[PDB]
Amino acid sequence: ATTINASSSAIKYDVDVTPSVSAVAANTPAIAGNLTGTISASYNGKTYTANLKADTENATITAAGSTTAVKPAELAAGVAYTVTVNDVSFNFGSENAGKTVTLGSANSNVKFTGTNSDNQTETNVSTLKVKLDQNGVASLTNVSIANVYAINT
C-alpha cells in the first residue's frame, strides 16, 4: 500500500457491476407496461452474468416518497423509478476462491447492500469490499439502480 487514500474505498473498485434494465410505460386503448433486464460484472478482463434466487418476484420497483411496489403493468413515462434486485450473486469461479475484491459501478445510480469482508452489513453504498467464498462466489442482499424511466412506445 503506497497510495494516499482519505476515502473509505480502495483504488476505485476492481469489479464493475452493470445492470441493464429496459422499462416500457403503459398506455392511456391500453398497453401494459413491462420491465426486464440482467446484471453483468467485469473482473480480471472477464464478464459474468449475475445469478438470482428466483425467476419470479425477484425485484421491486419504487417511485420516490413511497416504499410501495409499483406493478410493471402500470409504469408511467417521465417518473424516476428505483429498481431493487434481491439475492444477487456472481460466480467468479474456483480459481478466484478467497480473494478480497471491491464491487463498484461506473453508474452513480447503482448501490449495493450486503456483508463486507469485515463481516459488517452495509446498505445502499457505492462500493462494497467482499471476500469471495471457497468457490469464488460473491453474494449480495440486493443491488439498487435509481433513475430508471419507463419509455412510451
Residue numbers in the entry: 32 to 42, 49 to 65, 70 to 194
Task: Pull verbatim passages from the article behind this deposition.
S-layer proteins (SLPs) are self-assembling, crystalline proteins coating the cell surfaces of many prokaryotes. We determined the atomic resolution structures of all functional domains (I-III from N- to C-termini) present in the three S-layer proteins SlpA_ac, SlpX_ac, and SlpA_amy. The Lactobacillus S-layers are anchored to the cell wall through interaction with teichoic acids (TA), either lipoteichoic acid (LTA) or wall teichoic acid (WTA).
The SlpA protein (~46 kDa) is the main structural component of Lactobacillus acidophilus ATCC 4356 S-layer, built of two domains. The N-terminal part, exhibiting the first two domains (SlpA_I and SlpA_II), is known to be responsible for the self-assembly of the S-layer protein into a regular lattice. In SlpA_ac_I, the first ~20 N-terminal amino acids are not structured and reach out from the protein. The crystal structures of SlpA from L. acidophilus and L. amylovorus and observed crystal contacts reveal the self-assembly formation. A second interaction was observed within this crystal structure, a symmetrical homodimer interaction spanning from Asn92 to Asn176. The assembly is propagated in one direction by alternating SlpA_I dimers and SlpA_II dimers and in the other by the pore spanning N terminus of SlpA_I. The self-assembly region (SA) is formed by domains SlpA_I and SlpA_II, building a 2D crystalline network that forms the exposed surface of the SlpA layer. Furthermore, the flexible part of the N terminus (aa 40 to 49) traverses pore 2, very likely further reducing the dimensions of the pore.
